[PDB]
Ligand binder design. Structure first.
Ligand SMILES: Cc1sc(-c2ccncc2)c(C2=CCC(C)(C)CC2)c1[C@H](OC(C)(C)C)C(=O)O
Ligand SMILES: Cc1sc(-c2ccncc2)c(C2=CCC(C)(C)CC2)c1[C@H](OC(C)(C)C)C(=O)O
Ligand SMILES: [Mg+2]
Ligand SMILES: [Mg+2]
Lengths: 131, 131
């Protein structure tokens, strides 16, 4: 179902990576964040929701969505309630970039553009059809 | 044509807002950035390119794309070379949020979800068709 996303944080090099997966396509968005925090999560959701038709969000750690900041973002945006593969791609391009956040975005790109239709194409095809 | 984006910076409250417009749809992405810098622009493009099939980018200030960081990001991602309306929406929601970056993302959401088909729907429809 096309409005369903998964959201979790991983850790790498002492930093936090917020990973969102569009469950039906495998498409990912990610951001390096300073702190694993309610407010960072809330902001990330605001951004994600302005870009895609987000209806529901799941996570493997329910306490992620406990802050009032997160619930207020879900309320306003109308939202209700891969990490090893991405680390794999991060490891392969890690040498090419100084900043982890750069390596993360290179890895997101590679992941979404890989054909093995790509994830980036499936998300768009699934969403257009549903309209 | 569907791989064409426009990219510029505006200023608000002493901060920098990087605004990307998908020319064929009116769809926008935006980010508040600390500094109007080559490296911020480069990073923004990396992110944008991992999410949408970006072919070409235009800007109203050509010197924006002069840094080696920007050219290296365009090279790696395979890329070649609204602000008053968004400020309008920012002004309307500005009171609801503490941080400008939050007001910016609320305004991007509103702009992409408005029907007056919405911009968010047109981008997806235009891209799916082209595949
Ligand atoms: C801090 C720098 S300098 C620099 C650069 C400058 C000139 N030529 C090549 C790379 C780069 C790039 C490396 C990989 C890239 C393909 C994303 C493009 C730009 C970066 C890069 O940071 C950016 C993306 C500019 C914030 C990095 O973390 O190393
Ligand atoms: C720094 C805070 S606290 C807070 C909040 C907390 C509890 N209830 C309502 C709003 C909010 C929210 C305001 C508007 C919103 C619709 C995006 C949702 C979350 C914020 C918000 O910053 C975030 C989005 C958390 C980084 C802000 O700039 O004011
Ligand atoms: Mg988690
Ligand atoms: Mg400009």
């Amino acid at each position: 179902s096309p409005g369903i996303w998964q959201l979790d944080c991983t850790h790498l090099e002492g930093k936090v990576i917020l990973v969102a997966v569009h469950v039906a396509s495998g498409y990912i968005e990610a951001e390096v964040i300073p702190a694993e925090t309610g407010q960072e999560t809330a902001y990330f959701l605001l951004k994600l929701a302005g870009r895609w038709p987000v209806k529901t969000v799941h996570t493997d750690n329910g306490s992620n969505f406990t802050s009032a900041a997160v619930k207020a973002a879900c309320w306003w945006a109308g939202i209700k309630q891969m990490n090893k593969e991405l680390k794999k791609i991060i490891g392969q391009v890690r040498d090419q970039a100084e900043h982890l956040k750069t390596a993360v975005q290179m890895a997101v790109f590679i992941h979404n553009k890989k054909r093995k239709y790509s994830a980036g194409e499936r998300i768009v095809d699934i969403i257009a059809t549903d309209i």
